Write a protein that binds this ligand. Structure first.
Ligand SMILES: Cc1cn([C@H]2C[C@H](O)[C@@H](COP(=O)(O)OP(=O)(O)OP(=O)(O)O)O2)c(=O)[nH]c1=O
Ligand SMILES: Cc1cn([C@H]2C[C@H](O)[C@@H](COP(=O)(O)OP(=O)(O)OP(=O)(O)O)O2)c(=O)[nH]c1=O
Ligand SMILES: Cc1cn([C@H]2C[C@H](O)[C@@H](COP(=O)(O)OP(=O)(O)OP(=O)(O)O)O2)c(=O)[nH]c1=O
Ligand SMILES: Cc1cn([C@H]2C[C@H](O)[C@@H](COP(=O)(O)OP(=O)(O)OP(=O)(O)O)O2)c(=O)[nH]c1=O
Ligand SMILES: [Mg+2]
Ligand SMILES: [Mg+2]
Ligand SMILES: [Mg+2]
Ligand SMILES: [Mg+2]
Lengths: 456, 253, 275, 272, 267
């Protein structure tokens, strides 16, 4: 913090690292050493510019703290001053990894490292584009974490193209594979790696067996078409149902909840926030027995044989209703063993919607549960509304725009409300990550007397 | 950025020290002289009247004959099956999975790894051009990509800026608008230059305008705009085969 | 500052003998009712899509460069530097350099390529541009730091590409202010919009003044408006018509004169066609 | 604060004792209908694009600055002060000085330029110009003492400034300019343009202009007292005048006809 | 703060224990039954179609024959012009548009005889040009006891929310003080067809600024005339909304009578 620590004023000594696996020669070649100041031994690494002048110190203690000695630049790499060219470099994530690579390669290859890590890799890799021109191949060696995959994915835009390969590791990074005796598998990852292939560039050579797989399901959907196109629902998917106000989102998701608890036999955990708990159960009882219940006054008091219709469909422990919310859903997943989690309204729950969607995506990634989330649309500025038969685009998502970047499939419904008939819906798939194909799925009618969306 | 006149002593000599011909009808090379670096070729036709066949045949005749890497951004396995069925002269749209000649058909097409596909935007095309090293890039159905007038003009501006100072041949497929009087496009109406739907910036940034017309199976190829030479009109006639899929050049009067 | 009526005795006297028009080439009917081009002049050039704006402006630039000794600056955004350099070298030697592979192969193997290059650019008048707000700064550096007198901008729709109307109005205002109090001829190339009914502009339709696309602020800040026309589907595909649509200095509009394009030499010559 | 109507006899007595007058020129029906320009009013002159909206106003300025002795200020923003003070030399001597090099060389040779200069700019009747504009106009009114101020080409004081919303800026500029003209009581002649039509012929080919064709806002016709519109076809010299709105009197419509002399540059009255 | 309906007999008895008629055509008094205390009245026309002339005639008829206290607010112009216009309009002589008569009555000595006929009482009060306008109107309502307050121009008060807040504040003022209030506004620029100056029927949509100008006011009176037509002086009066009566549509017709200056009715 104060000034650049001289070894004379701090009792500098070059030693080895027994508990980490680095000898004294590698730290002597790099510049990593240990000072004795303030009683507690402080480890310290040295940074040098292109010329070779001492420009920065990195001070760490036995309890993993950070102490920058002054103005830390963005073009300072740990291991940059010693090499000024070559044909193959190895980019690591930390500083002990670069020492491990120098130990396992007998100080031969030009090996550099980052000074920020997976948090600020873009800032230290965008401004260092002029240094990477004198190289021929780059081997990225990141962590086997989520942040390492995020860093190697977001580092695809600031690096030169056609030269950089990515290697994989079974450990966290190179150091535990050095400790567990995997010194024969790291050299094959340095010498051989894989190309980028970022998300859309599929070469024709890599279709040797994918066409044969094409020339060879999951949870099905009720009512016509949908399951023929998106191949049903899978574990970990986040299904979105977007329509206009009054288009029948709750009836559709309630019919999907009924046919997944009486035929598939899976535990379904409901969460209705638009209404009370004494109404959705009556709606399920009316939906199962083919007779509409909540819209007839005489039949509500005629049957009160009510217990027979109750234990015919609620006789098991299948359904779980509900009257901060993430702990409730985590109890519904773990403590009850539910397979389907339905969230009816999200706007009553900018920065709030994004954080909520990241938290739900992390929950669905950790647990692996079928998750249905219902939201609403925007308000169109020119033309007809979504209730007279205007097709829903993927842009019109109510709230912060990021409802489509963290989802997996989107199903929309359209019907002419003030028209010639209101009982002929159109189902539109807007996005499917697995299958890919979009568009019109089928046509269903409502059948006003019963309440089942039978196909037509 | 300001470059004087005496700084081009050897850059012009390097620029003098490139043509990519068109297969099928040989009359097209008689007036537009093929293509070159920074060439936008807008190909249009009616509503499914020989719309995605000619560009696919030109891609196949550029891929396996001249060794040019052809990147198709078709809007993955379907176009590969279509290319395999097209090169072996069969009507794909069962037997080849049994006797094992599917690997024999696969090893003769993609064994020289020229072709590249797109998985179902401009940064990916820049990575396909600079990183992989292709020369011909084909885009289809630009109406799916794109107020429907400000977006298409900025899209054509960005594609023309990408084709400049890169040396790439960019083939773009678009649509036509619906007629109002007389006869329709499906009956053989002669197309005009102002039938390109969407905006009027499509013919102000393109370097070649090619149009295809047909009714029973005789097609007509018409050059509407050429910035290199300036010759327009009918370039020839081709005939489509209902048994192989290969439309062949004819000599109709 | 607010000036008075007595301090204008010397400055008007100096301005009265400072001003000299630059003549046009290719046609003599244009100079009879436009009287050339002076300092603080904006000349808008328009036609249909692919009718010959770039050829006419390149010919005007060549005749203003190699004959009168005027220092000419180009801002070709439609193409790059080497292409337009080859166009100028081929056009001055009365050939078509791009459309002949045999001529390009021949002139490099006999040593005369340095004969054509050193006779044009040896007098270092031409200054090209290698491709908002920095464009005006680079044009100001081209004017003040180099001393040019004619500045050409091609295909202005690249520069305006939120809302296009306010952007093109502010751009036209900035270019008019750059031409004002500097003393430089500014040639600007623009295009037309789509017609509504009838035949198109590429088949020989007479153009009005309200067809300049983008806004209506293009004809309100321009000093001279020239429109070129031809028919590519008629009998004569190389017979153009030049129409002066607006002249704020003289006030004469209408048809200037017909010309004829040569398919072999690249030049276009004054014809003698009668209506 | 408020003003009672009883203690107002002296102000009404001294107000109608004086102003009125300041006639136009070129035509007769303009002074028949509009009865001239008055102090405090804002007179808006419209034409097409290059149809003679700057020759007419400079001809009116030459009539008002010479034959009546009124001090006239000109905020010309199209061209510089070297050209708009050069045309007034030639128009007074019934020639076209800027459009002929021979007459320029002759008046350089014989020394007649000083005789043409001292016969017009002898009296301080012409003050030229080359939030930084309205302060200069207030200085012209207060410190210099001008009587007729000509604001030219208002389309480059609302488009040369960076504003996210253009129409509110035009409305604020228009109401501030009207408040200035009402407070100081100076005659103000403002020049604007027209917008693009939707169908039919163009304004440069003989379109009958309406009042809603004002380009930029909808308060240009709501805060002006007299709207003069010029129409001609390109006989390519028969220009007619339409008075579109007058707040003072009631009669609006076709005023008359004028013709442009191609050898001198005047707007002579015609008959048709 | 709530009030039950049973303990309200005394306030209903003292409340109900026609209104100010208009001038010009007799249909505007037959259709909307005149003006009432607490209303907000809007008068709409095109640019220069006779907004200030009609309301100035209304102020003259309400300030002389009825004798009620009338407060004008000419934000558009000065006070000498509207004073001379009222003096000329009461004497049936077009005063401001005549040069040979303004210098005639100042030397004859009968100028004060015309002055004290309508300004003899303390009836008329004038305004001399953001939030100070409401304080001045409250001063005109309290310290003078005005009955009809006329506001000549609402658009120059605006330097969308600034119009809604202003209209709610003016409605609250006119409801709390119980004063009759007339506010003049303009029409918007149309998109297709003829203009409002050549005889286009004005719809209720055409109001500049915002769309709550037709939601808070109690009546809207539009005036239309054909400027470039066979006659330029036959106007049409259209009632667009009336909460009290309900009947809307074309009320009647008035001619201008160019020499005198009175909107006298026609057939
Ligand atoms: C889809 C559909 C619904 N209906 C009925 C079913 C319901 O009783 C009613 C409304 O459908 P609901 O599903 O109840 O509407 P919603 O609560 O999901 O909407 P939101 O949450 O956005 O406010 O209409 C039909 O009659 N015909 C139909 O085709
Ligand atoms: C002048 C002229 C050119 N040509 C040919 C020769 C030219 O190489 C070719 C194109 O000339 P260009 O001038 O380059 O065409 P353009 O600038 O109008 O097109 P764009 O709008 O896309 O910028 O046209 C004719 O056929 N007839 C003619 O009269
Ligand atoms: C009035 C008139 C002008 N002219 C010519 C002579 C003038 O020098 C020329 C234009 O002179 P200007 O008066 O400067 O034209 P303008 O002010 O209308 O231009 P802009 O709208 O772009 O500001 O028009 C005619 O030919 N016939 C005419 O009737
Ligand atoms: C009512 C009317 C007025 N006029 C003329 C004569 C009046 O002196 C002149 C006064 O116009 P104004 O009444 O002042 O016009 P305005 O108030 O509607 O518009 P703005 O204040 O926004 O400019 O209108 C007619 O010619 N015919 C008519 O029918
Ligand atoms: Mg619901
Ligand atoms: Mg061009
Ligand atoms: Mg002008
Ligand atoms: Mg008024």
């Amino acid at each position: 913090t104060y000034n650049v620590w001289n070894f004379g004023e701090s009792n500098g000594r070059y030693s080895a690292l027994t508990a980490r696996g680095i000898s004294k020669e590698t730290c002597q070649k790099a510049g990593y050493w240990i000072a004795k100041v303030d009683g507690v031994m402080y480890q310290v690494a040295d940074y040098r510019d292109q010329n070779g002048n001492i420009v920065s110190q990195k001070v760490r203690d036995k309890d993993k703290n950070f102490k920058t000695t002054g103005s830390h630049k963005s073009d300072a790499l740990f291991g940059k001053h010693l090499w000024n060219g070559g044909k193959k470099i190895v980019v690591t994530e930390g500083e002990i990894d670069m020492l491990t690579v120098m130990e396992l390669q007998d100080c031969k290859y030009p090996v550099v490292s980052l000074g920020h890590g997976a948090s600020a890799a873009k800032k230290t890799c965008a401004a260092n584009y002029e240094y990477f021109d004198q190289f021929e191949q780059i081997i990225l060696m990141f962590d086997m974490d989520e942040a390492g995959r995020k860093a190697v994915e977001e580092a695809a835009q600031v690096l030169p193209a056609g030269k950089v390969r990515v290697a994989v590791l079974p450990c966290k990074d190179a150091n535990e594979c050095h400790l567990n005796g995997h010194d024969r598998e790291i050299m094959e990852q340095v010498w051989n790696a894989g190309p980028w292939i970022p998300d859309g560039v599929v070469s024709a050579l890599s279709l040797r067996e994918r066409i044969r797989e094409h020339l060879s399901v999951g949870l099905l959907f009720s009512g016509c078409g949908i399951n023929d196109k998106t191949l049903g629902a899978r574990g970990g998917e986040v299904i979105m149902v977007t329509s206009g106000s009054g288009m029948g989102k709750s009836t559709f998701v309630r019919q999907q909840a009924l046919q997944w608890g009486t035929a598939m036999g899976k535990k379904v955990g409901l969460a209705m926030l638009q209404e009370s708990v004494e109404e959705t159960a009556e709606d399920l009882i009316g939906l199962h027995n083919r007779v509409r219940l909540r819209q007839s006054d005489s039949l509500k008091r005629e049957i009160i044989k009510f217990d027979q219709w109750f234990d015919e469909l609620f006789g098991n422990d299948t359904f779980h209703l509900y009257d901060r919310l993430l702990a409730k859903l985590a109890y519904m997943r773990s403590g009850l063993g539910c397979d389907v989690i339905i969230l009816d309204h999200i706007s009553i729950v900018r920065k709030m919607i994004d954080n909520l969607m990241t938290k739900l995506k992390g929950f669905a990634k950790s647990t692996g549960v079928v998750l249905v989330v219902i939201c609403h649309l925007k308000n169109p500025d020119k033309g007809k509304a979504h209730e007279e038969g205007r097709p829903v685009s993927i842009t019109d998502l109510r709230g912060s725009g990021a409802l489509r970047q963290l989802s997996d499939t989107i199903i929309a419904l359209e019907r002419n409300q003030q028209g010639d008939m209101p009982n002929l819906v159109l189902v539109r798939i807007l996005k499917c990550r697995f299958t890919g194909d979009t568009g019109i799925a089928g046509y269903m009618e409502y059948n006003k007397e019963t309440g089942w969306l039978e196909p037509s």
